[PDB]
Amino acid sequence: SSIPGPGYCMGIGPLISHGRFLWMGIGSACNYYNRVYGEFMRVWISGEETLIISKSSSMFHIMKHNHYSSRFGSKLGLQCIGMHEKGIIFNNNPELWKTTRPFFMKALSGPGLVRMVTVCAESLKTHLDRLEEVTNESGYVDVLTLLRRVMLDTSNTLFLRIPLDESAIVVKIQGYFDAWQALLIKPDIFFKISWLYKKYEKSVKDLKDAIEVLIAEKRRRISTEEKLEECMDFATELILAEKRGDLTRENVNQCILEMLIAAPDTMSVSLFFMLFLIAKHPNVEEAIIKEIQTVIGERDIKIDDIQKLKVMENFIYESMRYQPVVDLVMRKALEDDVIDGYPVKKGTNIILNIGRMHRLEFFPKPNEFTLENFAKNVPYRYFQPFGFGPRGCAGKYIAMVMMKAILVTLLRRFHVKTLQGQCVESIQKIHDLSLHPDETKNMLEMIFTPRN
C-alpha cells in the first residue's frame, strides 16, 4: 500500500518532524500527525523512521507478536537516566529484558496482589488521619502529593520494606520523571552542549543516591537473616539472584528504582483524574457508594470483594478510556513484517496511540464520559489501556486492584469537590511522555468534605 506521511524534502522532512515533537510534546505530535495524515503514518525521530498508529488492528498485531517486544529512545538519554539496557520499562536489550521481566511479573501477581489490596487500604488510612500534611488553610488538599505518598508508601511496604522519608523521595521521583521525559528523544547534538542537561543529570543522581542508601540497608538485613525464604519480597528475590550470578548489581539497583517510581508516577496521576471525574458526575458517585454499602458496609476491604465492585470497575475503565494518563506506547520492530498491507522494516520505531484509538474505534459514545460505553462487555481487542502479550503492562493486574482499593477507602469516607469551575477538561495538561496535569499552573487542589 506504501506509507502515508509528510515529504522527505531531501533531509528536511526528518528535521521538521523531529523538531515538531520537541516543541509540541511526544503526546500531541502523535495526535497531530494522526489527524492530518492517516491513522498509520511515517515520521522521523532522529534519523530512524518511525510509525505512529491508532488503528486498532495494527495496535493488536503489534502487542500480540513476540517480534515487537522492544521500545526505543535516545541511547544517550536512556543511559543518562540509567534505563539503557538496565530496567525493564525501557530495557531494549531483548535477552537482558527477557531475564528481568520475570522478577517484576512474579512480584506483581499471585500472593503479592492479595497482600496489596489490604496494604493499599492500611497505607491510605494512615495518610487520611494526617490531612494536616497536605491541606491548605482554606481547606484545599494537595491531592497529587497525597496520592504520590501513599503510592510510594504502598510500593515500599510491598516490594522493598525499608524505612524511608516519603516526603523527600516523592519530590525526587518527580525530578527523575521530569528528566526521563525530557531526555527520552533529544537528538545527539543536544548532549554535546553540556550546560543544557546538567539539571537533568543532577535530578537523576538525587534519586539514585537516595536509593543506593536504601538498597544498602536492604542488603544488610538479608546478610543477617531470620531464616531466608520466610518473607520473599521483590527486592530480595533480585538481591539473591545477584548473589547467584543472574543479575549485575547495577541492573538490580535499577529494577528496585523502576519498581518504586512506577506507582507514584502513574497511579497518582490516574487516580487524580478519576477524582475530578467523580467530583463532576454526582449520578456516578451515587452508584459507587451504594455498591460499596451493598458489598462491604463498614467492614474492611478484602481480596474476595474486588470482582463484585463491578460499577466501580467500569468507572476506572471509562476514566482511563476518556481521560488517560498513558495515552501512547512506544515499541520497535525486531523482525520485518507486513502489517495491515504496509511493509515495516526491522528497526522501525512504533508509537501506538492508544489514547486516540479509544475514540475512533468500537465504543458507542466515544467523545463523552459515560459509564454507558462499558455497559456491553468490551472485547479488549478494541480497548487496550494497559497493553498485553509478551510486553503488556506488568502492573496491569495489581493496578486494577490498587485503584479499586484506594478509590473505595477514599470515597467510603469523603465527598470530593473541585475548586470553582475546574474539571478534567478545563484542567491544563502537558502532553509529553504521558498525559499529566501541568503542575506549575494552580487550581489543581480538591476539597475533602466528610461523609455520614
Name the site residues for ligand HEM (rule: CB under 6 A).
Answer: 63, 88-89, 101, 104, 108, 262-263, 266-267, 270, 325-326, 329, 385-387, 391-395, 398-399
Spatial distance between the Cα atoms of 75 and 83, rounded to a whole number of angstroms = 9
Spatial distance between the Cα atoms of 352 and 446, rounded to a whole number of angstroms = 33
DSSP 273: H
DSSP 444: -
Residue with the three cell numbers 515533537: 21
Spatial distance between the Cα atoms of 374 and 292, rounded to a whole number of angstroms = 19
**Nearer of residues 356 and 436 to ligand G29, judged by Cβ:** 436
Q: Which one of ligand G29, ligand HEM, none interacts with residue 399, CB within 5 to 8 A by kind? A: ligand HEM
The least CB distance from residue 298 to ligand HEM, in Å, is 27
Spatial distance between the Cα atoms of 450 and 287, rounded to a whole number of angstroms = 18
Strand 49-53 and strand 342-344: the pairing is: unpaired
**Nearer of residues 31 and 371 to ligand G29, judged by Cβ:** 31
x-or-dash pattern for ligand G29, window 269-298, by CB under 6 A?
A: x-----------------------------
Is 330 labelled a binding residue? Answer: yes
x-or-dash pattern for ligand G29, window 125-164, by CB under 6 A?
A: ----------------------------------------
Q: Which one of ligand HEM, ligand G29, none interacts with residue 62, CB within 5 to 8 A by kind? A: none
Q: How many CB atoms lie within 10 A of CB 186?
A: 20
Q: Which one of ligand HEM, ligand G29, none interacts with residue 88, CB within 5 to 8 A by kind? A: ligand HEM
Helices (H), 348-417: 354-360, 396-411
x-or-dash pattern for ligand G29, window 255-274, by CB under 6 A?
A: ------xx--xx--x-----
DSSP 226: S
Residue pair 276/436 in contact (Cβ under 8 Å)? The answer is no
Residue pair 335/65 in contact (Cβ under 8 Å)? The answer is no
DSSP 434: S
Q: Is 72 in the site for ligand G29 (CB under 6 A)?
A: no
Residue with the three cell numbers 495491515: 340
**Nearer of residues 13 and 392 to ligand G29, judged by Cβ:** 392
- Residues forming the site for ligand G29 (CB under 6 A): 71, 89, 177, 261-262, 265-266, 269, 325-326, 328-330, 433-434, 436
Binding site feature residues for heme: 393
Binding site feature residues for substrate: 265, 330
